[PDB]
Structures are given as C-alpha cells and as structure tokens.
C-alpha cells in the first residue's frame, strides 16, 4: 500500500548507490540526514539533477545535508534523483540478492530497512 521499496545498485566496488521509498507513519516529520549498512564501509547522501551546458542537456550529482518525509506521507530516493552513494564495499554487489540499510533520522531515531540488489 505504502511499502519500504527499493533496490541497492549493482557493483563489484568499490562503490554503489542505492534508492528506496522513505514512509512516515507519524503526526510529526521524518528527516532522513544518513545511513548505515554491513556492505560499505561509508555511506554518503545525494541529488542527482540536470543542467545545460551549450544547450546540451547534460546531468549531475552532489551530496545533501538530509531528506525530508511529512506526516502520513512518503518520500523517495530514486535513480532519476536521490540517493545513497555507498563506498568501501563488502560484498560485491549482484543482481538479486538482497541488502540491508539503517536510515539515520533527525533527533533520537533510526529505521532499519531490507530491500533487494537490481542492476537497475
Ligand atoms: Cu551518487
């Protein structure tokens, strides 16, 4: 209905991304400023955009302070934007497996989620 759906990206290393659906079940505001997992050894949080240059559409990336989720709604990291950047892997990173994240949430709080490896 919601869902917490999402895949981690495909890599031998030494580095992946991965995307996933941020839901709030609260009256109050989620915010998502980093993460964990026991595949890499760092983890950062990402835009990805598009820009000109010459009147060539041509993208980009940067890192983000954190995510934010509103109360009852939902929130995604997703391969035409948002993003973990996961770096010093453990496993290299296959097509179907599966993988899990910790999502380091603003003041007091943590959501450990499970999601799937897709070479997407
Ligand atoms: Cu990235």
Known sequence: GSFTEGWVRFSPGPNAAAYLTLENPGDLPLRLVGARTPVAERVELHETFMREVEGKKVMGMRPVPFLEVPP?????????????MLLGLKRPLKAGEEV???????????????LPVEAR
Do not use: S
């Open 72 to 84: 009852k709604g939902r929130v995604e990291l997703k391969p035409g934007g948002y993003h973990f």
């Open 100 to 114: 899990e994240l910790d999502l380091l949430f603003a003041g007091g709080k943590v959501l450990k989620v499970v």
